Amino acid sequence: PSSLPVFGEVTSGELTDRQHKTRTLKETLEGAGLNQAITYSLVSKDHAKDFALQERPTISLLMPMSEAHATLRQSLLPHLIEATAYNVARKNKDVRLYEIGRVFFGNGEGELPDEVEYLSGILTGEYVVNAWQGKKEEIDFFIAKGVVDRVAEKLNLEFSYKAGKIEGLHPGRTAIVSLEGQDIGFIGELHPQVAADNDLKRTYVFELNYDAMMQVAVGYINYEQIPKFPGVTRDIALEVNHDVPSSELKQIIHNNGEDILQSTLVFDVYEKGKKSVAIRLNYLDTEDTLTDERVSKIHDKILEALQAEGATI
Amino acid sequence: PSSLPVFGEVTSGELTDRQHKTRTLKETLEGAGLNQAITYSLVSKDHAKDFALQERPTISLLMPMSEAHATLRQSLLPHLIEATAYNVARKNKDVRLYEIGRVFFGNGEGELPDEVEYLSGILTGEYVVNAWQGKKEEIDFFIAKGVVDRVAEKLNLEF
Amino acid sequence: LMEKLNQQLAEETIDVTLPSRQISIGSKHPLTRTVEEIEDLFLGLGYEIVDGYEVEQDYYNFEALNLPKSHPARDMQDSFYITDEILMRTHTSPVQARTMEKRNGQGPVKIICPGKVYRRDSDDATHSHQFTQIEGLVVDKNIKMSDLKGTLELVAKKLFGADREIRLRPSYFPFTEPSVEVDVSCFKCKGKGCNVCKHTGWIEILGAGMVHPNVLEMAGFDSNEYSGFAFGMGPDRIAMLKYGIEDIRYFYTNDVRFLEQFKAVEDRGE
Amino acid sequence: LMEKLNQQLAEETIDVTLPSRQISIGSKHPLTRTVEEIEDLFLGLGYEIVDGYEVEQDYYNFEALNLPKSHPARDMQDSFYITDEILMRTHTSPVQARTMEKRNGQGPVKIICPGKVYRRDSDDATHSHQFTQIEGLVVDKNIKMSDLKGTLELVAKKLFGADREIRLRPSYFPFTEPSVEVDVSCFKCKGKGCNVCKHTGWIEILGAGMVHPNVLEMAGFDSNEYSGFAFGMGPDRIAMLKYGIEDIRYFYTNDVRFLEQFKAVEDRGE
Numbered sequence A: 001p002s003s004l005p006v007f008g009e010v011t012s013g014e015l016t017d018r019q020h021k022t023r024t025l026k027e028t029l030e031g032a033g034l035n036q037a038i039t040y041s042l043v044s045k046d047h048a049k050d051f052a053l054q055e056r057p058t059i060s061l062l063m064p065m066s067e068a069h070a071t072l073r074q075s076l077l078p079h080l081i082e083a084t085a086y087n088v089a090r091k092n093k094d095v096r097l098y099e100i101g102r103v104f105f106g107n108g109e110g111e112l113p114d115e116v117e118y119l120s121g122i123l124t125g126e127y128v129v130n131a132w133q134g135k136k137e138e139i140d141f142f143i144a145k146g147v148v149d150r151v152a153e154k155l156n157l158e159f160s161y162k163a164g165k166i167e168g169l170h171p172g173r174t175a176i177v178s179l180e181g182q183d184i185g186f187i188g189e190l191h192p193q194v195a196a197d198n199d200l201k202r203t204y205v206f207e208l209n210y211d212a213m214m215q216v217a218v219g220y221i222n223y224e225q226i227p228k229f230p231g232v233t234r235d236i237a238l239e240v241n242h243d244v245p246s247s248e249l250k251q252i253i254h255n256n257g258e259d260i261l262q263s264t265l266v267f268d269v270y271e272k273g274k275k276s277v278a279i280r281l282n283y284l285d286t287e288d289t290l291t292d293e294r295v296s297k298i299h300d301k302i303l304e305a306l307q308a309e310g311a312t313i
Numbered sequence B: 001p002s003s004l005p006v007f008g009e010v011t012s013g014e015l016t017d018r019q020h021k022t023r024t025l026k027e028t029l030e031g032a033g034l035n036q037a038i039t040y041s042l043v044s045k046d047h048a049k050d051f052a053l054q055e056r057p058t059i060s061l062l063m064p065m066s067e068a069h070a071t072l073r074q075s076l077l078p079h080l081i082e083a084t085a086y087n088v089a090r091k092n093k094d095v096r097l098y099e100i101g102r103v104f105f106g107n108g109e110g111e112l113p114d115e116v117e118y119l120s121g122i123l124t125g126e127y128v129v130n131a132w133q134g135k136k137e138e139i140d141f142f143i144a145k146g147v148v149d150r151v152a153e154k155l156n157l158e159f
Numbered sequence C, D: 001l002m003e004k005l006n007q008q009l010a011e012e013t014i015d016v017t018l019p020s021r022q023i024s025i026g027s028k029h030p031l032t033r034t035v036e037e038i039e040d041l042f043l044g045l046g047y048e049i050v051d052g053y054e055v056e057q058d059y060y061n062f063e064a065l066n067l068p069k070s071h072p073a074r075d076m077q078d079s080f081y082i083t084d085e086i087l088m089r090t091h092t093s094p095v096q097a098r099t100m101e102k103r104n105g106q107g108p109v110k111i112i113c114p115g116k117v118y119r120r121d122s123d124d125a126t127h128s129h130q131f132t133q134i135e136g137l138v139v140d141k142n143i144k145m146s147d148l149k150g151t152l153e154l155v156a157k158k159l160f161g162a163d164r165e166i167r168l169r170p171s172y173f174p175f176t177e178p179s180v181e182v183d184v185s186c187f188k189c190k191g192k193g194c195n196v197c198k199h200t201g202w203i204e205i206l207g208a209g210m211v212h213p214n215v216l217e218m219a220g221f222d223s224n225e226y227s228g229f230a231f232g233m234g235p236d237r238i239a240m241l242k243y244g245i246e247d248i249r250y251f252y253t254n255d256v257r258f259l260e261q262f263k264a265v266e267d268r269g270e
Ligand SMILES: O=C(Nc1cccc(S(=O)(=O)N2CCN(c3ccccn3)CC2)c1)Nc1nccs1
Pocket: C073, C091, C093, C094, C096, C097, C135, C136, C137, C173, C174, C175, C176, C206, C207, C208, C209, C211, C212, C215, C230, C231, C232, C233
């Protein structure tokens, strides 16, 4: 007979927080044009340490059936690169993929490895196309960052981004990604050599420790009140070591703006030897009455913190 | 005492198909930059027939508290237009909204109306912007169609 | 070549610190978030989610919920009537009564009905002529108020965190008997006391109680066989509590500066 | 002006028939779709979803599932061993054994474990050295095979439609007793017979049966008190059946011409 068990201890069935976030995150990556990939965990012993940033033992099988599938994976990128190489060879030029999957790091002999869940993906081709209108937006580095920014937004996480040098990557178009003073991944264009080996045009990858991401407890959304009156916007113009991260400007500015700095934007750059950074500051106070005197006091303390960590105008 | 009821006829709790599709569809509209709106069902009697394509009786309240809220809605667009007008006046120039909500059509007197669930939205401003790169893609008609194409794709429907 | 591709390399260097090309995310309405959260809690307990009419018959709005034609509740002054007999619904209970009757007197019933509701009132920062309810209804055969209490506890944890407790205070609604008004332990102050909870450490979030015999019977269920519990809550109120939202009208005004704060996931925190 | 804005109107006419600016949608993997479908079925019945290690100890892969050190199952030839004692897992049951033991001998247990699994084999169109399983495990106090049967019926309907029936055939697995192999009525031919079902009208989709006493006891549960049912299925196989996918390797090759066919919702049809 067909029956169903009646449980006497009642619990509501739900995804864990991590499980729920992961459904949501996949949704937002799919919402942005990225296809979900599933790649093989096992790589060639030669490639097992490709893109790994900590040096760490790899895990080989006693008896592989294939030299293609001999060693566990310390990165998702080798097979996602392969997969992009393969699509491109078949005249599928627009490739956009992401994967959430384990990588494997030896805890030495007789010991289970660390299995760490990564989030990575790879992008090449057009992001936006409508030929008849003359619309063609080619994937570049900042599109790839946009993807990674959008992951951070959805998850309510604060990522920072400093220039970097990695392995398979264009050394002047690579960045390390940090969360809470921990490095957790990177984004970058593939080295022009590695592209060329794989018959690939401009291509970008990102790779992230999803386990690190998932450790940040973000709580409930922090709502701010809606302002009943306007804020104030001022655009400053700087001159820098053409050579300095915009991130460093944003950081002091935001270190000096107290209560009432709402947001900033670098909206223009020029470069011999120095660069101009135009940045738009948005002051606002949804809480108390904003005054011109506080906004000039703070403004000018901003432009002074800037001068002293080394900035003209 | 704190207990929970144990049901003896067991059924798995799930969204209906329609319910499920609706969660999924909202997800895909949010994934494309559209904010979920919720507007007031009641409009001014003057606007109640705004954008309606079949001629059809409107439903008025015996005792409105406001002339703003006197008659049910045969379209979502009057209040979504209002809402865009309002944002824009506050210097919020990029407005992207969608709503799934009922509109109301009289089956004449003493009869419950037809309550029909609509999907609408409204768009103005930039769709894609990165100023420092000189990127600015302004919303046009084909962007708006792209949204509607994307609704058809996700739902597996041919429009 | 290892000159030329090498100094192509260098003409191609970028500040990786600059603004990404945003791929913007739209927001989920705060009111929808609360409703779906609660959908998910109850799907996982075997319940269905039901929708019904926003414009309703006065029999289902009132008569079937134990409000005879006399009753003050039915004042033309406090509900948006369209004729004598037809009006904007005031609660989502009509849906639950229409649902019960269809079951001709066999359980279980276990339903959750969220939706828009309507009240003849003037609008300010705490009052809206259109707002939202979620109700539910369980009808089965040895259903107890202990069972309504455990259900409320899960609801309160769902909304406001695993550590929440509840308090039940006696009260009165015509459609239930016994009736309760339900508080959640304040999620801000442990239980010292604060602005949020009016320094009592308890915040009222729900009403509930046992379905009233007459309500069961008008719908065809046998009150000697079947008991029943039901409950209501108001996402507008819940979400103003949870977030410190200052004005109920902000839900229906669609300032993007309000809407766009609600892009991101949340968790149990720490 | 009603000249000039009027002939602006006309210089602004467009073919609305032209291609929209696509806002492209990425695809959900077919294998993930099946897993999540099944997650959703069982969340709604009160179960939890559990993940475990892909590289596992031979005690949990084997010993705890009633495969003593002798047993042919443990051949170095058919599993990817890393040492004598450590190997790529062959099934998701290690997770379920590790989970039971942690419960020190109190129920319920009701879990669903999906994941990647590994087999020492050569790859072709029907064989993959890496593929996917979902198992589950219910342990409670008067758990019957009628209860496993009703659960399988829901699974089969979930996957292949409300009209599906199942068939249970006797079989043998070391970790269960009684054991069954489970067919679903063919979803294509009513029950005439077809290519899809090898003209028998039944398609094998699952195995299952009562958890074996030794398996319960090695994990600490008392087999005089507690019974148990468990089951496995393979999304790779399910999804090749459901869609007519011609090559298991297509799941792990990530041709976008394969992936991008799986953008859209589905329904119960008609
Ligand atoms: O019984 C209910 N729901 C119910 C039970 C108690 C409390 C509340 S509540 O707090 O939201 N409420 C809303 C309505 N309020 C009213 C309405 C009219 C008269 C008095 N008071 C009181 C507070 C809802 N519905 C059923 N459907 C079918 C059968 S029973």
